[PDB]
Amino acid sequence: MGSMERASLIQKAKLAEQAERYEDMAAFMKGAVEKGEELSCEERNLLSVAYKNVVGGQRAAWRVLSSIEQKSGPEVREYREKVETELQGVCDTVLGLLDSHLIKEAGDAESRVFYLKMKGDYYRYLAEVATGDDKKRIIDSARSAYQEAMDISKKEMPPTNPIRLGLALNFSVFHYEIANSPEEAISLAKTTFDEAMADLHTLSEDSYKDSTLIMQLLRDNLTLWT
């Protein structure tokens, strides 16, 4: 994508989203990041949507194959491994964009928290498939990224800010599903929900709708976990 203008890559990412062509969308947004300029809020959202859809399809396929393998010639394991390697490659690509150089240039809380949440998310997806001598280190990398994002969010954003809420939601999923810490997951979701509820009175109608949508996801997890 080096020969395409930044603005044209952004426009094509938006068209690829409308066309449900998420691999194309991710390639356009990687090209846009590699121009070297910081991303606006809307551009960060395009980057995250693109890779979430790509890695989401890979994770769903890995889970199907892993289930068949666990019920079970070499073919199911070989194909699960192929999908696993592809998934790992996408997560490494995202992590490499964050490390070269999105996080280090992000100075505002909204951008820095967003990118650190992404870093925690993509290490968490690596942790979902990890088994070898690096599973522990991958889990700690997710935890460290989420914890730095939490520390900034609590100091710099109100408790209803949607990024702060989505960070807390995903960190609680990390505790429940990856770190074997269901009580930490439940405590974080409950405290996050309660502190957001007490700040809703400060919001406009549209901000209220954005925050309460994410609060409902926290409630949905608490219903499954309690």
Binding site: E17, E42, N45, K52, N170, V173, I214, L217, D220, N221
Partner: peptide, 9 residues
């Protein structure tokens, strides 16, 4: 359970 769906801009 559910992380942020995050699949639509």
């Amino acid at each position: 359970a559910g992380s942020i769906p995050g699949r639509r801009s």
